[PDB]
Write a protein that holds these residues in place. Structure first.
Motif, short mmCIF file in Angstrom:
data_model
loop_
_atom_site.label_atom_id
_atom_site.label_comp_id
_atom_site.label_asym_id
_atom_site.label_seq_id
_atom_site.Cartn_x
_atom_site.Cartn_y
_atom_site.Cartn_z
N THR A 119 0.83 -1.09 0.05
CA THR A 119 -0.05 0.06 -0.14
C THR A 119 0.91 1.08 -0.15
O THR A 119 0.36 2.32 -0.69
N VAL A 120 1.92 1.11 0.99
CA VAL A 120 2.82 2.40 0.93
C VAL A 120 4.24 2.13 0.42
O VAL A 120 4.59 3.20 -0.25
N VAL A 121 4.55 0.92 0.59
CA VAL A 121 6.18 0.86 0.00
C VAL A 121 5.88 -0.31 -1.25
O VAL A 121 5.14 -1.41 -0.88
N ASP A 122 6.61 -0.24 -2.10
CA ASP A 122 6.85 -1.14 -3.08
C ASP A 122 7.63 -2.41 -2.74
O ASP A 122 8.86 -2.45 -2.94
N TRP A 123 6.99 -3.50 -2.07
CA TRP A 123 7.80 -4.31 -1.42
C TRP A 123 8.48 -5.13 -2.65
O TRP A 123 9.78 -5.63 -2.39
N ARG A 124 8.06 -5.48 -3.62
CA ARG A 124 8.49 -6.40 -4.72
C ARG A 124 9.86 -6.09 -5.25
O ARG A 124 10.99 -6.88 -5.27
N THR A 125 9.86 -4.67 -5.76
CA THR A 125 11.20 -4.01 -6.25
C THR A 125 12.48 -4.29 -5.43
O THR A 125 13.33 -4.90 -5.65
#
Ligand SMILES: [Cl-]
Lengths: 247, 247
Positions: free
Chosen positions: A22-28
């Motif tokens: 939601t807030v951070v792009d975990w995957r990248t």
């Protein structure tokens, strides 16, 4: 003048956020650190896919504790156990590798980059509302992340403070109560309808933040709202503007 | 910039956490004013400063009941509303002939206090290199309310009701450090009260004295200089910030 929730009839006083996705792009961020590990230690991996295999162990590793079959431990411990888990399925023995170097990798989840709208949107929401995470992350992971990335939270009620994971009702209820707020004075902003459902079921305001590439260009789910959340939004900048119009 | 290593703990400091009432905000003027205002709106007469100083007198005694085991923990809010009743009675007023809800409002005056002028900028500077938050007997919701009305830029708020402990119970300190993922020696306690700093030194936390000679007004006797061999002795929070950067 704050935003009054149509679903819950109260004036919102806190907009708390699901954090991963939601807030951070975990995957990248997870793929990045995995690629760095992979190169440095001469493994042969699809970093992206590996991150996806590591994320897919998240709920099941939490499901064990939700049901009562396992006694509460911190997301940092789960994340570390799941990494071992994903290595072995990839046909790599953990103790062939240095344990502290693998803890470091496991703390990649502390180090995540916001979406480009996140800090500016949250900065603007903080002017008018209490903001903070409403997240399965434990307090110290969330705080490390907030400090690394400059996520300007006012308060960090980590899962390890409630000793509960989402979507356990008490995740929501206990957060609301340690903050001094009726459930309906608390809005949950989330990219995940499921999380929003459970939030609503507890009597929280809801806001949906579309996140079409959290899971990459071939994402399948949460591509629109499947519920009548108070707010549907294209990002946190949109959330802030819509919160400001009112109801 | 290079971190401040505590000489007493030997460890690099990572979190500088604050006693709040007194060290950061001027509770006395704040409560004096609110009382005088309630007094005037309900047509009663009292030395509002005195009443403030008696209300403060009931702080540690209301806590000692919980510290000794003699009572089940409750939120400082609940304690403060109870002591309000107490002090009213001492001042000849009977709380039953006042609106409960209006007294519940008067009791939450501890949520609306003014920082000393040096506090917000000093904290802002420390925030740029360290984790900052309170280490205080206030409950989370109270301290958050305070941060929001006065712009005190905490990163994290571990209220007394999260630890279910009140200071100087050594657990209060130890659970704060733990929940933040830090070794006790990595947390600094900044306080204007020597007996809080001593409780925290003996638990292994780093230490900072901040001189607040008028917290109890011009006729203040206590804590008019540092009585321990603290890591840092400061004139104000901005001075603390400078000494931290000095090394
Ligand atoms: Cl989360």
């Amino acid at each position: 003048v704050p935003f009054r929730s149509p679903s819950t009839g109260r004036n919102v006083r806190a907009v708390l956020f699901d954090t991963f996705g939601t807030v951070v792009d975990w995957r990248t961020g997870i793929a990045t650190a995995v690629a760095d590990y992979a190169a440095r230690h001469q493994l042969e991996v699809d970093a992206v896919a590996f991150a996806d295999r590591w994320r897919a162990r998240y709920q099941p590793s939490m499901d064990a504790i939700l049901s009562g079959a396992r006694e509460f431990v911190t997301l940092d411990i789960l994340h570390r156990e799941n990494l071992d888990f994903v290595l072995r399925e990839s046909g790599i023995d953990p103790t062939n590798h240095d344990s502290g170097e693998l803890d470091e990798l496991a703390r990649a989840w502390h180090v995540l980059t916001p979406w480009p709208d996140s800090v500016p949107g949250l900065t603007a929401i903080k002017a008018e509302y209490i903001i903070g995470p409403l997240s399965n992350g434990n307090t110290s992971l969330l705080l490390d992340m907030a400090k690394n990335a400059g996520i300007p939270w006012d308060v960090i009620i980590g899962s390890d403070i409630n000793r509960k994971y989402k979507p356990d009702p008490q995740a929501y209820l206990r957060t609301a109560q340690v903050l001094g707020l009726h459930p309906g004075e608390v809005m949950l902003a989330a990219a995940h309808n499921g999380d929003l459902e459970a939030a609503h079921a507890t009597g929280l305001a809801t806001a949906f933040i579309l996140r079409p590439v959290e899971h990459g260009p071939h994402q399948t789910d949460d591509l629109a709202p499947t519920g009548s959340w108070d707010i549907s939004a294209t990002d946190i900048t949109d959330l802030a503007a819509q919160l400001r119009a009112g109801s």
